[PDB]
């Protein structure tokens, strides 16, 4: 296996069933196996060796203790953080909304710093996002000078403020997250852009 | 790609046929065998069979127990299907010119198509206590291929198979692959169908599936329904090179074979049509025979009103594209003379084409008042054989195909060729 | 029946008569099953028409 | 020849199929008269017993009448018959999946051609054979009857009815009929007579020959019962006279002219007399006991709360079709929800009771005076402004009336809560019901059996008023939502959103972030616990508050 | 919201996509595992919600006499109006030779 | 396989008492007989496979067990059955006529009568698997009594070697719907009186 070491990054664990009671019985079976194998290997197995039926649930957790609490919450049927439930209706019918930088100056501006200050953490978390953001960032620098590269690495209040640096960081992050969603195989049927960020929707 | 030689054929078919030569007389004279219900079977049918017409083997209730060394008690306990195979296999070795005493200890394999005929359910009473002990092996489907190998002392493989109507073409495909794999020296392939109980005719009549006059009017515009009939048949096979080393007769050469399912999807796309168009391509490839070289096809042609149209469409999609000038594909079906024959439809077809090769003529398809309107004849590259035509030996190697279909979704195809027939 | 029993009773009743007695033109989810949903079925084995 | 079974003869008899109620004749040597016997297997019962009373299978009265006629006519080719003094005691019934034995007999009376017939119902186990019909047979009717009558002349005095309502009238009389017995095709009724068009009356063995009289005679019972009220079943007929098998269509006439008895006549499509019946009495078994005939068991029925964890997302509010009216015990709550509906682009109006202060610019309504007229005369003012109403929210403060008033009486509080809510709801229904408004009643701590605190008894008139609407204005959609009385209340767009996903009506509840829905569901009851029970000997017991009939049984 | 959610940055995006997957979009989760040490293992199979499917309703567990009819006496009739009991048998052709020795 | 290994490694045996719940008209003719039964073969889940319950009542128990067991085979083979639709997979089943319609002590209801044919013909048992999973290969049933499973494997191995197909499914089923094979093995005294296959012992 030559298996690498890693920190305890979150695992998406997916279950499906053709009726509600079978989903709850499936959670009682799987809860006894997540104790033996590593959660990343169980999650990689259920994504690939199983169908995609109509009744669905998703459990998120960093490690064995959290994932066991999620599968117990499903098995007893009680709501808890990191558990999601529903019944699929097959049609695609999806649209995607995009926004510019400067609208974050309208109100609660520090929250539109804190969103981008959080969004930086995705660069370590996913393979597809980093390359997309880096391609856009190095492509923008020739139009702007070097300071845009610092601004993408330090997405503070500029992401909320009507400025060339702010608009540049906003286009970079929107373009990168669009490549992220298309790597997760979400496909839009329509796009809408609000204010000067309309270029991203285009 | 070793060619496989039919050394001999034996059969029983509707209307007093006992040999390939009798089936030729019946088709070349343009007769049909469909008739009234049999007397002498134990059938206490109600009003449910009034007006039902079908093809029956008259005399299936009679056998010669002493010739095969049975007790008459055991001969009564056996399913009529096991008895017809046993009687027909002796006739198959005799026309192949092999002494059955010299066949003992041979690596001859057996592949029999049989379906459960319900025979002991004829009894009103409980059985006599001496018959009861024989009823197990007398009526098990798995014992039918075993009995032949015990009687003739054969040491090769033995299998009974079921696939509804395609059972003979499926049995023959396994026997051809066994001979190419080097498993066996000879192979015996065939099947039987006998109605010991009336219940299958009642089930088709209750659902109104039969033609009202009992004729399978193959590919015609009339297309009123299907027609059930009986039949039994065995072919003996060997590799062409081994047949010529020994100097046995060759009646025809089997060149390539295939089987597929028609899957499961919406009927609007014609799934059974798409299945035929793949199975023909597969069979032509297995034999390494080019699609221009086939002259004729013995089509399935059962008389189901859409199904004959799907078959004609599939042939236009597959053979009908590359025809040489003056060589359009001739189509016909033996079911028109003798009814559907259920499990042995492929043997009935092979006997016709084997006799056609030997007599340099292709027989007409009976009751064709006009071609079916459910498919497009406007290419001229395919037609029904409505008047018989000559088929001489010459510079072009003669070749023909056979098709069988069934509702469970199995489909298949075989290609046959002339014997090499070197000069005496 | 110490706790969690809800509104609880004991009788002979056929609820299919009860909701159709009097009259009622619209559903009542206390007695009737909530709703239908989007799924489809095969034409069965053997059947291959049109 | 090598075959198990010897061959059948070249010719044989047709072995004609028996009529399913009389079966095959016995052959006792010394017996004074003929007898016949049958077992019905549990699969066959559903085809012969074509009628249900309160879910249990029962044999139709026209089928008992045909059974006696088939028993009578077994010995002869004659085409016309008479039965007299016909009596049909009790109900022949067969609980689901049980066998049914049947027996019948003929005896010569010694009065020339006169013969007596009887039918006897199932003997099994510890039970024994009992009488279920009897009649006297007179062969060879040999008398003239009236000439033709045009069937198209018959209906003129009477109104026509839909055959759907004819069978719905019979359903409200405990009776349902399987498809072979639904033989009516047109019906007219009024006063003291009725007429009807009867299709091919094709019972088992009925597509040709005499057996079709079973369902033709049953149509005479269906029509005779249609004229009355309350449940009833046939008991006697004084004459039945029949000539030939009935034609593929027949016309019936039924009349109530005799004291407590019907007469009936059956006419061919050509207007020929086919059969006649006189003195058909149902009255001696008007109103016989359903509790012994009903198929259902004693069970424990419970309102169980199911979480909407599947599909629990609110969906959109139904567009700008009209305003929403919000009434509450708290002016601040009413105003807050009217601000919330404004953020979402939904038009809304705030209302308050006139004994509360006008603190936040609401409309005011005389709720607290118990009278729907003064409430209606207030709601009519909004229609005179041109306001249109999509729906109405009524929100209750919960236990807050206790510390506000400083004294406890849950029964007087329930009397007040009922009176207030009734005044509002009736006053609204009078003014707007033609608009098909949606009514939403929003209690707190009313729902039983859910987790998180006890129920508050003073809420109880709200659950009552909800069910009081569901069965009495059945065209108007409505819902009850029960809030948690101590957690913060949810956003009004969540409440209305999940409620607009219900067509018709339902009960919903909120505890934490979850939505729940109530269903009435059933399980078996172990009555054998009481068969093992004895009460402790060193004690006294109370029976309280009951009438004589309940008290005597409690004491027993 | 696709960037916004709970405090660990991965849980926000996986939860937002999780809701789209739950509602019906055919999301490919493989980016959550790509570049990490993932293996494959045998896991329990689907839990069937079974019900009785048989031609015959289950027979009651009552003990009875194995072969009570005497070959000539046969079956006792329950003719209701009878003065005393009568009994009947039909013998089939294969039975006749067994009883008539 | 893991349940068989637990039984075998714990040194147990599984021959026991005759089944309740099946409608058997066995009097003293099976008194004291012991045999190994699949408990609950009369229970099935029609909604999972897409059958109306009257068709699922019409089917021979052997067609039901093969159909259940095939789904479990794919879920351990690591192939989602939705990905297998349109594959060149062949089917070879060792199966025997089970007499299941002869349980009925009376003529059937007219709703089930039109399904008993393809419900009980042995040659339907290959084709119905191929329909449920959408498999395009050859589909045959074989019978040669006890050896019917080796015959199915041999023909499947020879089919894969000759390049006829990309996958193959080979196996069988056996259920005692009727008691008659146990009645006759007891009548002729072929059964051990303690019911154990003492495989090579003295
Ligand atoms: O090879 C062995 O040693 C095992 C022998 C087992 C033979 C089992 C055959 C079962 C056939 C049942 C059958 O065909 C039937 C039952 C009822 C009506 N037909």
Numbering used by the authors:
A (entry chain A): 457 to 658
B (entry chain B): 33 to 456
C (entry chain B): 1670 to 1719
D (entry chain B): 912 to 1467
E (entry chain A): 861 to 961
F (entry chain A): 52 to 253
What does the paper say about this structure?
To confirm the binding mode predicted by the MD simulations, we tried to prepare cryo-EM samples of CalA3 with the amidation product 3 and the hydrolysis product 2, respectively, and the two complex structures were finally obtained. The cryo-EM map of CalA3 with the hydrolysis product was resolved at overall resolution of 3.97 Å and the hydrolysis product was captured only in the KS domain of chain A. The carboxyl oxygens may form hydrogen bonds with C197, T438, and L439. Additionally, the carboxyl group of the hydrolysis product could also form a salt bridge with H372 at a distance of 5.4 Å which also demonstrates the positioning function of H372 predicted by MD simulations. To consider the pyrrole and the carbonyl group of each chain as one unit, it is shifted ~6.5 Å and rotated ~53.6° from SNAC-N1 to the hydrolysis product, which the latter is able to further translate ~6.4 Å and rotate ~74.4° compared to the amidation product. The polyketide chain moieties are subtly moved within the range of 0.6 to 2.2 Å between the SNAC-N1, amidation, and hydrolysis products. The accumulation of 2, the hydrolysis product, was also observed. The hydrolysis of SNAC-N1 may be due to the open-ended tunnel of KS on each side, which is solvent-exposed. Similarly, a motion of this unit combining movement of ~5.8 Å with rotation of 34.9° is also observed compared between the amidation product and SNAC-N1. Together, the visualization of the products in the KS domain verifies the basic binding location in the substrate tunnel analyzed by MD simulations and further reveals the structural flexibility of the polyketide chain.
Here, we present the cryo-EM structure of CalA3, a chain release PKS module without an ACP domain, and its structures with amidation or hydrolysis products. The domain organization reveals a unique “∞”-shaped dimeric architecture with five connected domains. The catalytic region tightly contacts the structural region, resulting in two stabilized chambers with nearly perfect symmetry while the N-terminal docking domain is flexible. The ~360 kDa megaenzyme uses only the KS domain to catalyze one C–N bond formation (or hydrolysis) and subsequently release the polyketide chain.
